[PDB]
Amino acid sequence: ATKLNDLCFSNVYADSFVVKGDDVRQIAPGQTGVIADYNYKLPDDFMGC
Amino acid sequence: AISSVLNDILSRLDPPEAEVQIDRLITGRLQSLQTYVTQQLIRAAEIRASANLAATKMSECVLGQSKRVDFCGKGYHLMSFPQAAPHGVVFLHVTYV
Amino acid sequence: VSMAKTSVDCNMYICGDSTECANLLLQYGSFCTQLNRALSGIAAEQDRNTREVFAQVKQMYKTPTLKYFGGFNFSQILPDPLKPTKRSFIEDLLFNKVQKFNGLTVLPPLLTDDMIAAYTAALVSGTATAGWTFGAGAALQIPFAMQMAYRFNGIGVTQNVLYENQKQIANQFNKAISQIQESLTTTSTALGKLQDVVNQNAQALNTLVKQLSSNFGAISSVLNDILSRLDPPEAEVQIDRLITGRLQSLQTYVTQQLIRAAEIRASANLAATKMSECVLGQSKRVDFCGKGYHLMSFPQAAPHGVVFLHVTYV
Amino acid sequence: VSMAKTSVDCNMYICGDSTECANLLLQYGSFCTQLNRALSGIAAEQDRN
Amino acid sequence: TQHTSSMRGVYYPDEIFRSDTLYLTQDLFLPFYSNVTGFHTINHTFDNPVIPFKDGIYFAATEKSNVVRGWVFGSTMNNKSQSVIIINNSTNVVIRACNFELCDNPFTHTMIFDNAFNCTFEYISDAFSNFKHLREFVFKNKDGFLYVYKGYQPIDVVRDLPSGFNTLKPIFKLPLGINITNFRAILTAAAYFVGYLKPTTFMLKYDENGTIT
Amino acid sequence: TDLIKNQCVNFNFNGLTGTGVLTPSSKRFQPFQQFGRDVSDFTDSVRDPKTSEILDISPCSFGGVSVITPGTNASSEVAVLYQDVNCTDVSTAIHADQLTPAWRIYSTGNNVFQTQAGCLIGAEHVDTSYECDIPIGAGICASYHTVSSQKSIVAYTMSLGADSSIAYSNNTIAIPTNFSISITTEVMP
Amino acid sequence: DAVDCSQNPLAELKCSVKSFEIDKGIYQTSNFRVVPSGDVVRFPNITNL
Ligand SMILES: *[C@@H]1O[C@H](CO)[C@@H](O[C@@H]2O[C@H](CO)[C@@H](O[C@@H]3O[C@H](CO[C@H]4O[C@H](CO)[C@@H](O)[C@H](O)[C@@H]4O)[C@@H](O)[C@H](O[C@H]4O[C@H](CO)[C@@H](O)[C@H](O)[C@@H]4O)[C@@H]3O)[C@H](O)[C@H]2NC(C)=O)[C@H](O)[C@H]1NC(C)=O
Ligand SMILES: *[C@@H]1O[C@H](CO)[C@@H](O[C@@H]2O[C@H](CO)[C@@H](O[C@@H]3O[C@H](CO)[C@@H](O)[C@H](O)[C@@H]3O)[C@H](O)[C@H]2NC(C)=O)[C@H](O)[C@H]1NC(C)=O
Ligand SMILES: *[C@@H]1O[C@H](CO)[C@@H](O[C@@H]2O[C@H](CO)[C@@H](O[C@@H]3O[C@H](CO)[C@@H](O)[C@H](O)[C@@H]3O)[C@H](O)[C@H]2NC(C)=O)[C@H](O)[C@H]1NC(C)=O
Ligand SMILES: *[C@@H]1O[C@H](CO)[C@@H](O[C@@H]2O[C@H](CO)[C@@H](O[C@@H]3O[C@H](CO)[C@@H](O)[C@H](O)[C@@H]3O)[C@H](O)[C@H]2NC(C)=O)[C@H](O)[C@H]1NC(C)=O
Ligand SMILES: *[C@@H]1O[C@H](CO)[C@@H](O[C@@H]2O[C@H](CO)[C@@H](O[C@@H]3O[C@H](CO)[C@@H](O)[C@H](O)[C@@H]3O)[C@H](O)[C@H]2NC(C)=O)[C@H](O)[C@H]1NC(C)=O
Ligand SMILES: *[C@@H]1O[C@H](CO)[C@@H](O[C@@H]2O[C@H](CO)[C@@H](O[C@@H]3O[C@H](CO)[C@@H](O)[C@H](O)[C@@H]3O)[C@H](O)[C@H]2NC(C)=O)[C@H](O)[C@H]1NC(C)=O
Ligand SMILES: *[C@@H]1O[C@H](CO)[C@@H](O[C@@H]2O[C@H](CO)[C@@H](O[C@@H]3O[C@H](CO)[C@@H](O)[C@H](O)[C@@H]3O)[C@H](O)[C@H]2NC(C)=O)[C@H](O)[C@H]1NC(C)=O
Ligand SMILES: *[C@@H]1O[C@H](CO)[C@@H](O[C@@H]2O[C@H](CO)[C@@H](O[C@@H]3O[C@H](CO)[C@@H](O)[C@H](O)[C@@H]3O)[C@H](O)[C@H]2NC(C)=O)[C@H](O)[C@H]1NC(C)=O
Ligand SMILES: *[C@@H]1O[C@H](CO)[C@@H](O[C@@H]2O[C@H](CO)[C@@H](O[C@@H]3O[C@H](CO)[C@@H](O)[C@H](O)[C@@H]3O)[C@H](O)[C@H]2NC(C)=O)[C@H](O)[C@H]1NC(C)=O
Ligand SMILES: *[C@@H]1O[C@H](CO)[C@@H](O[C@@H]2O[C@H](CO)[C@@H](O[C@@H]3O[C@H](CO)[C@@H](O)[C@H](O)[C@@H]3O)[C@H](O)[C@H]2NC(C)=O)[C@H](O)[C@H]1NC(C)=O
Ligand SMILES: *[C@@H]1O[C@H](CO)[C@@H](O[C@@H]2O[C@H](CO)[C@@H](O)[C@H](O)[C@H]2NC(C)=O)[C@H](O)[C@H]1NC(C)=O
Ligand SMILES: *[C@@H]1O[C@H](CO)[C@@H](O)[C@H](O)[C@H]1NC(C)=O
Ligand SMILES: *[C@@H]1O[C@H](CO)[C@@H](O)[C@H](O)[C@H]1NC(C)=O
Ligand SMILES: *[C@@H]1O[C@H](CO)[C@@H](O)[C@H](O)[C@H]1NC(C)=O
Ligand SMILES: *[C@@H]1O[C@H](CO)[C@@H](O)[C@H](O)[C@H]1NC(C)=O
């Protein structure tokens, strides 16, 4: 995160939503659960933040 | 590793974690060097065998007359001449048939 | 003058029908390709090693109608057409004493035993009647006794000695052959050198297979027992660890095969020289074509090797 | 026409005075043993030479 | 009395079929020529002490009158904790794991325990109805299970345990989940023997039939 | 499900999974054995949990595949060799496409000939012999020749050399009455 | 230009040697295998619920 200031990008995208606290942990690659499987899925790759 | 390019790890990735990525990449590459040099030693040994033979032939086919059959040519050895060649030696074997 | 033309399926060996494994193998680049070429190179050399030794004559000759030459028997050296086989008696004796989920196999040689036997037969026939130009140019028919007379001259024995003692010499020759037959028939040390090469080959392959069961610090040596109970994160970590181990086992094997191949090449090169100097002519150098003053010699076919019978004056 | 008959105890070399090391070494099976034999087989020919 | 184990105490270590092969492994086997302890039931003297288990033992008995009926395996050997009683009940084989109030000297009547509480395991087999018979057993603890092997051969010995070789076959794998550190023999002349198993490396020779010879 | 035999299937027994070919066997299993292994640590056979039948597991055919070609500057043609495979299975799995890799444009014609080396498809077999150009194995070589004005890849038995013969006598001899001088070459790195 | 490495055996060799020109001879370009058909699943008889 520190080094984001040293990088250039062709674009920046941002996704936004509200979830239950316990479900926040599902917003990551390699996860399973109600959110991870049926609401919001991430690819097997890095995520900005 | 994240990337084959060292700079694309070291530059952007957090310096702690980066050591893990770098260490892995280093190990990977070191293995190819060990493989490469091993094969080169083996190849070199084969060349020695060839060079040793060439030296023998020079002495016995050019600087003298060999009697051992088929060493300096199929026929009955009379003469030979060496020629320069790109990383090798070319012989002209003159024989009686 | 050869070793088994082995071959290894890199993917089968490393990744036992595992997709995840394969993906984690591709990440290592040309690993499998490099191994494949190395083994292929060896197999190619194994072929040359045989051809360079046996194919010394451009013409194939027919077995002589009669094998009896000036009292010299020869019957156990040449093939006997009465039998369905194409080998000599001695050769038959020599040849009597020497898929899988591991992805390992062996390829056949270009020249089969029958083809090799044919070459040896031609060389013996040549030796017996073609004279001194057999391997130099057109064959020149010569009476056997006259050929021997020449050989004795080369030893440093006055020509007449052979003729005067021809009967005794032919008898001793024939006897010596019979003696060898008995020695070969009833021994177990004979082509120990050839058996040694075979044994070592087997050990290398056995070792390689055994390594598939190696754990390498992993949860399990079996990929299926990694995937079946682990989330993808750890599963990949475990697979990668297992792959690393197996990758090393292959490079180790090939390295040893390359070294081994080099030694076989050296042997094959010498065999070619000996045939040229001891069979196609009369070598004068000491202690090269037997343990006496060289007269002549005969080649015989053998399972992955060459057997020479060296006839010497003592 | 010869070289020194090198011989090394592969157990002591790797896990000298360590049980825990040996316990982990065992996970590599007979590697240690095979390697030892391979070396001996070389020393054997020095006598022949 | 101390005796020699000879080459006895060998058993099939796993349910894996093999054929015509030499298999090298390591397990709790009875060491060859180990020190075997003999026990006797003669006239007024009956050996029925509590013997340490040491994670696995070897047992054998020479019979002509079926004096030996079973064993009790456990820790405290009383109704304070769990123990398992394994007996030939004369019509059925009966195995029970409970907090048993055991007889201090157990033996037309079954005198093994007065009470049983907190039973966790019960099993009853199908029904049935010089020394002559040698019975052999191996008892091992693994992952809460009591592994039991059995064998048998005809004999003609008076006091000793004849030298020989015999591979035993598995019979029970009891999911007892109990602590076995000690055991006692259950008796009705006769004799029996106890040895101890060790994590020893053995080379086993499998014949064409897949049996160990 | 029912057992599917004598073909490659995906199997799942209660404790053993994988792929391969299931066939009946006579292995002498004991009353306390479920499955067995080969000399090497691979599953040999399994006893069925339902019918108590014993079936062996064979590997699905696999191997190396090589191509035989002339130069691309001469023509565009190729014969394909499948190492150590019975041509009956090769053909079957082409019609019943079960092969990996499969080609987008490919078929199997009458040019099918099996050698010890493996199954060779695309070459024309002949009953004659020639100098071995491209070695295959077991006395078989490939070459590119005109076959009654179109050239093609052919499979043939290699010749061992020229066919000749000389007479033997106890009273005659051959002696050269002429000679020539020739020059040959040799190269070494 | 381009080579479709799946079109035919010739393409595979061209791709393998990274060249649009091949001189002569016999080359191993890949392995091969047969693809399995259906599934076979087997279990014990009794189900104790
Ligand atoms: C070059 O040197 C070789 C080696 O010495 C000679 O070859 C031998 O030639 C003889 C000639 O026949 C072979 O003779 C053998 O005789 C055995 C005895 O049985 C016969 O003789 C007794 C004598 O009283 C009679 O009672 C009996 O009825 C027979 O007449 C046979 O048993 C041998 O048979 C062999 O071949 C058959 C073929 O199927 C086999 O089944 C037998 O087991 C056995 O192998 C044979 O007949 C002798 O065997 C030859 N030896 C070899 C090694 O071949 C050459 O003749 C000599 N060349 C010249 C020109 O002299
Ligand atoms: C020089 O050495 C040779 C052989 O090394 C000697 O020839 C051998 O001479 C003995 C008798 O002196 C022969 O033995 C006889 O053979 C006949 C054959 O039927 C037999 O009937 C007799 O009872 C006896 O066994 C022997 O066979 C012979 N060797 C050969 C191959 O013929 C030679 O005599 C030696 N020179 C001198 C001067 O002694
Ligand atoms: C295992 O079971 C035995 C049963 O024999 C238990 O031993 C018994 O424990 C009781 C209680 O301390 C002892 O005293 C008895 O108390 C009752 C109370 O009314 C009284 O009526 C009896 O006369 C007696 O006093 C009893 O003597 C004792 N039995 C013996 C033989 O000593 C034992 O404690 C149990 N073990 C565990 C771990 O529970
Ligand atoms: C020694 O073994 C005998 C025979 O198993 C035991 O006697 C038997 O005890 C059972 C009760 O546990 C009696 O009832 C049986 O119950 C089963 C329950 O499903 C039922 O299927 C049977 O038909 C029967 O009702 C059984 O009748 C009885 N048999 C006899 C001959 O007495 C005996 O208790 C055992 N002794 C010890 C100390 O365990
Ligand atoms: C272990 O493998 C051996 C193989 O030697 C099996 O023993 C053999 O079993 C056969 C069948 O009962 C025995 O009888 C034979 O029958 C044939 C029928 O034509 C007959 O020609 C033979 O002369 C013989 O009568 C054979 O004697 C027997 N061999 C021995 C040494 O006992 C054995 O049954 C296998 N064990 C198990 C558990 O299957
Ligand atoms: C699991 O339960 C099934 C019950 O269907 C058992 O399968 C059945 O086994 C019998 C004996 O092999 C099969 O053959 C039958 O034999 C009788 C003999 O008289 C015959 O009358 C029938 O027409 C038939 O041939 C029967 O087909 C078979 N049933 C099925 C659906 O396969 C199975 O053996 C049990 N497994 C175990 C381990 O007991
Ligand atoms: C390629 O596969 C085919 C088909 O399996 C093989 O042809 C078959 O070869 C067998 C000999 O092994 C032929 O004889 C059979 O022998 C068994 C032995 O018990 C017998 O039970 C059968 O009734 C039969 O006699 C079989 O007839 C033959 N099939 C055909 C259709 O001819 C072929 O040999 C295989 N090629 C290679 C190189 O292995
Ligand atoms: C030295 O003498 C030998 C023996 O005569 C010559 O070899 C033989 O030469 C004839 C004629 O060139 C070869 O052909 C034969 O022709 C007759 C004519 O009717 C025919 O019936 C035969 O079937 C055969 O075709 C004969 O094959 C040949 N034999 C061999 C073993 O080569 C030899 O050429 C003479 N050498 C010199 C330098 O004159
Ligand atoms: C070279 O070896 C051949 C082997 O066939 C010799 O030819 C044969 O020579 C004999 C003697 O001149 C010929 O006559 C035979 O004499 C015996 C005497 O008992 C008689 O029993 C035979 O029936 C026959 O008459 C024989 O026909 C002849 N064979 C042939 C096929 O021509 C030849 O003489 C030897 N040459 C030299 C220089 O030794
Ligand atoms: C060994 O064979 C060679 C074959 O070339 C012989 O050499 C050749 O001998 C002829 C006659 O002496 C040479 O002259 C030729 O004469 C004819 C007559 O019309 C003429 O048309 C030709 O153009 C030529 O002049 C011929 O040039 C010569 N070959 C060469 C390359 O010079 C040789 O003599 C034979 N050796 C023995 C010892 O017989
Ligand atoms: C029957 O066995 C159970 C355990 O298998 C006993 O319950 C345990 O008793 C000990 C006594 O200190 C407690 O510490 C454990 O926590 C208890 N476990 C449970 C799950 O409650 C039970 O008391 C035994 N009953 C008898 C009569 O002995
Ligand atoms: C019986 O026990 C005593 C105890 O010391 C021992 O000395 C004696 O030898 C034992 N009997 C036999 C036959 O060993
Ligand atoms: C085994 O028993 C004999 C009996 O006399 C004894 O002397 C020996 O020391 C015992 N061995 C061990 C290790 O106790
Ligand atoms: C069995 O009892 C002994 C007695 O001290 C104890 O140390 C041991 O841990 C017990 N084992 C189990 C599994 O409870
Ligand atoms: C190779 O290409 C050249 C290009 O003109 C052609 O002439 C030559 O004949 C080709 N070689 C073969 C074997 O066709």
Question: How far apart (Å, rounded) are the C-alpha atoms in residues E172 and E166?
Answer: 19
In contact, C81 and C88? CB cutoff 8 Å = no
Which of D27, D30, D34 lies at the smallest CB-CB distance from C215? D27
Question: How far apart (Å, rounded) are the C-alpha atoms in residues E41 and E21?
Answer: 43
Question: How far apart (Å, rounded) are the C-alpha atoms in residues B13 and A2?
Answer: 9
Three-state SS letters, E30-73: CCCCCEEEEEEEECCEECCCEEECCCEEEEEEEECCCCEEEEEE
Q: How far is the CA of F74 from the centre of ligand 15 (A)?
A: 6
Q: How far is G18 from chain F (nearest CA, A)?
A: 14
Question: How far apart (Å, rounded) are the C-alpha atoms in residues C237 and C223?
Answer: 12
| Residues of B (28-57) whose Cβ lies below 8 Å from F | 47, 50, 53-54, 57
In contact, C298 and C124? CB cutoff 8 Å = yes
- For residue E124, the tally of other CB atoms under 10 A from its CB is 12
Report the run of H or E that residue E187 belongs to, with start and end: strand E182-187
Question: How far apart (Å, rounded) are the C-alpha atoms in residues F169 and G16?
Answer: 60
Q: What is the DSSP string of F11-60?
A: EEETTEEEEEEEEE------TT--EEE-SSSSEEEEE-TTT--EEEEEPP
Question: How far apart (Å, rounded) are the C-alpha atoms in residues C111 and F82?
Answer: 20
**Do A6 and B14 count as a contact with CB atoms less than 8 A apart?**
no
State which amino acid sits at residue F117.
Answer: A
Touching B: which chains, 3+ CB pairs < 8 A? A, C, F
Going by C-alpha positions, the residue among E66, E59, E24 that lies closest to residue E149 is E59
Which of B28, B46, B97 lies at the smallest CB-CB distance from C262? B46
**Helical segments of chain B, H only:** 7-10, 15-57
**Do F166 and C129 count as a contact with CB atoms less than 8 A apart?**
yes
Q: What residue's CA is closest to ligand 11, atom 6?
A: E118
Q: Determine if ligand 15 sits within 6 Å of the CB of residue F72.
A: no
Report the run of H or E that residue A36 belongs to, with start and end: helix A34-38
Nearby residues of C166 by Cβ (< 8 Å), 6 or more positions away: C70, C71, C145
Tokens representing B27? 């190990």
Question: How far apart (Å, rounded) are the C-alpha atoms in residues E61 and F183?
Answer: 94
**Sequence-ordered strand ranges (E) for G1-49:** 25-34, 39-41
- Buried/exposed C84-109: b ≥16 CB within 10 Å, e otherwise: eebbbbbbebbbebbbebbbbbebbb
Question: How far apart (Å, rounded) are the C-alpha atoms in residues F162 and E46?
Answer: 96
Going by C-alpha positions, the residue among B93, F80, E198 that lies closest to residue G12 is F80
- Buried/exposed C13-41: b ≥16 CB within 10 Å, e otherwise: bbbbbbebbeebbeebeebbebbbebbbe
Phi, psi dihedral angles at C187 (to 5 degrees): -105, 180
**Residues C125, C130, C131, C137, CA torsion sign:** negative
CA C313 to chain CA centroid, Å, is 29
Q: Report the atom number in ligand 9 closest to the C-alpha of F171.
A: 38
Going by C-alpha positions, the residue among E209, E212, E213, E208 that lies closest to residue E20 is E208
Q: How far is C202 from chain A (nearest CA, A)?
A: 44
In contact, C19 and C226? CB cutoff 8 Å = no
Question: How far apart (Å, rounded) are the C-alpha atoms in residues D38 and F133?
Answer: 40
Q: How far is the CA of C49 from the centre of ligand 13 (A)?
A: 64
CA distances from E124 to E93, E96, E173, F186 (A): 6, 9, 14, 90
In contact, E198 and E36? CB cutoff 8 Å = no
Task: Judge whether C20 is closer than 8 Å to chain A, CB to CB.
Answer: no
Which of C11, C12, C40 lies at the smallest CB-CB distance from G28? C40
Three-state SS letters, C252-306: HHHHHHHHHHHHHHHHHHHHHHHHHHHHCCCCCCCCCCCCCEEEEEEEEEECCEE
Q: Determine if ligand 2 sits within 6 Å of the CB of residue C172.
A: yes
First and final C-alpha spacing in chain D: 6
In contact, E118 and E78? CB cutoff 8 Å = no
Nearby residues of A22 by Cβ (< 8 Å), 6 or more positions away: none
Report the run of H or E that residue C237 belongs to, with start and end: helix C232-274
Q: Which chain F residues are closer than 8 Å to G7 by Cβ? A: 103-105
Which of F62, F135, F169 lies at the smallest CB-CB distance from C141? F169
**Do F135 and G8 count as a contact with CB atoms less than 8 A apart?**
no
